[PDB]
């Protein structure tokens, strides 16, 4: 399955993450959504290790205690047999896509789709790209089985 993690009400995370999620479920992949601001670390761990793919919205530079712990827990559990889909949440002071991408590739992950770079208010175009990215990731998984 694919785990989609993001911050509730941070930038356009809910909306971009939902658009990617919509693309993903249409292909028949089971999507597991998690709110980094409040999810339980213990389950997050199991959720990540069994995930065939991980989709993460960019988290702000100075993340809080819960989300830094959540973030660290994903990195700690992510491994080399899975894909990473990154999308810019367009929040306030958030971590650059490139930085996260480096971390994941070093753990041995490949990209689930091209990073979704949003540098302005997400338009319908951007949401279509999120949906298409979810669809593509889904079909890539539906075929690798």
Structure description:
The protein has helices spanning 13-26, 41-50, 65-77, 97-106, 124-143; strands at 2-6, 31-35, 53-57, 83-87, 110-111. With 145 residues, the chain is α/β, with parallel strands linked by helices. The chain has one domain: Flavodoxin domain (Rossmann fold), CATH 3.40.50.360. Strands 2-1-3-4-5 form a 5-stranded parallel sheet, with helices on both faces. Helix 1 packs parallel to helix 5 (124-143) and helix 2 runs parallel beside helix 3 (65-77). 41% of the residues are buried.
Summarize the structure in short:
The protein is α/β, with parallel strands linked by helices. Helices cover 46% and strands 15% of the residues.
Strand order of the largest sheet: 2-1-3-4-5
Number of domains: 1
Q: Find the structural class using helix and strand composition.
A: alpha/beta
- If you consult CATH, what is the topology? Rossmann fold
State the helix count: 5
How much β-strand is present in the residues?
Answer: 15-25%
What is the architecture at the second tier of CATH? 3-Layer(aba) Sandwich
Largest sheet: 5 strands, parallel
CATH superfamily: Flavodoxin domain
Indicate the radius of gyration in whole angstroms. 14 Å
C-alpha end-to-end distance: 12 Å
Element-level helix/strand string: EHEHEHEHEH
Please tally the β strands and state the result. Answer: 5
CATH class: Alpha Beta
Shape: globular
* Helical content class: 40-55%
PDB class: flavoprotein
Keywords: Q5MZP6_synp6, flavoprotein, flavodoxin-like domain, dfa1, SnR135d, nesg, Structural Genomics, PSI-2, Protein Structure Initiative, Northeast Structural Genomics Consortium
Assembly: monomeric
Entry title: Crystal Structure of the Flavodoxin-like domain from Synechococcus sp Q5MZP6_SYNP6 protein. Northeast Structural Genomics Consortium Target SnR135d.
């Amino acid at each position: 399955s694919v785990l989609i993690g993001y911050l509730s009400d941070y930038g356009y995370s809910d909306r971009l993450s939902q658009a990617i999620g919509r693309g993903l479920v249409k292909t028949g992949v089971a999507v597991e959504m998690v709110d980094l601001r409040a999810v339980d670390p213990q389950e997050l761990i199991e959720a990540v290790s069994s995930a065939r793919g991980i989709v993460l919205g960019t988290p702000p530079s100075q993340p809080s205690e819960a989300v830094a712990t959540a973030l660290s827990t994903i990195f700690a559990a992510a491994h080399n047999k899975q894909a990473i889909g990154l999308f810019d949440s367009y929040g306030g002071d958030d971590e650059p896509i490139d930085a996260l991408l480096a971390q994941f590739r070093n753990l041995g992950l490949h990209t689930a789709f091209p990073p979704i770079r949003v540098k302005d208010q997400p338009t319908e175009a951007i949401y279509q790209q999120c949906e298409e990215s979810g669809t593509d990731l889904g079909q890539w998984l539906t075929r690798a089985d």
